[PDB]
Homo-oligomer: A and B are copies of this chain.
Amino acid sequence: VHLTPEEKSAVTALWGKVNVDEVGGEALGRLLVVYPWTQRFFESFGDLSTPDAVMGNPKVKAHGKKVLGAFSDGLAHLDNLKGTFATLSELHCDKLHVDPENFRLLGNVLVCVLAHHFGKEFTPPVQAAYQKVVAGVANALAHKYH
C-alpha cells in the first residue's frame, strides 16, 4: 500500500484514538450480524442468535481484539503487508477456505465502525486513506488465492 506521508499521518493519528479493547469486537460483531453466513466460521463461539447476543458475546469481543491487532500490525508496516499477513493468509485461505470477498466486507465494516465512532472527524479524505489500508489488508490476507 502506497500512502502519502499526509495520508499515513491522518490514518495513524485516528488509529491512536481507536479503543484497542472494543473496536475490533464491534467490527467482527457487525460482520456476523450484517453478513450472517460468516457465522458459519464461528460455531465454537457460542451464542450468535440475535444482534444483542453477538455484540455481547465475550468470545466475539476477544477475537475482535486479535483482528484489530492484525490491522494495527498492518499499519505498522504498510510496505510489507504480504509478509506481515503470510501466516494469517495460510490460515484463512488454505485451512479455513474463507471466500476472499468476505475480507473486503470486514474491512468495510471496520470503516463503518470508525465513521460511527468519530463522526465528522472521519472526513472523506480520511476514509479514502483508510480504504487504501483495508484493501491492502484484504489483498494480503487473500495472497494464497492469488
Contacts and interface: CB of A to CB of B under 8 A. Distances in A.
Interface of A: 139, 142-143, 145-146
A64 B145 CA distance: 28
- How many copies the complex holds: the figure is 2
Contacts of A143: 146
A144 to B, nearest CB: 12
Residue among A139, A143, A145, A146 having the largest count of chain B Cβ atoms under 10 Å: A146
A139 B145 CA distance: 9
A142 B143 CA distance: 12
Nearest to A135: B145
A75 B146 CA distance: 18
A102 to B, nearest CB: 15
A73 to B, nearest CB: 20
A143 B145 CA distance: 11
A137 B143 CA distance: 16
Contacts of A146: 139, 142-143, 146
Contacts of A139: 145-146
Across the A-B interface, give the 5 residue pairs with the lowest CB-CB distance, nearest first. A146-B146, A139-B146, A143-B146, A142-B146, A139-B145
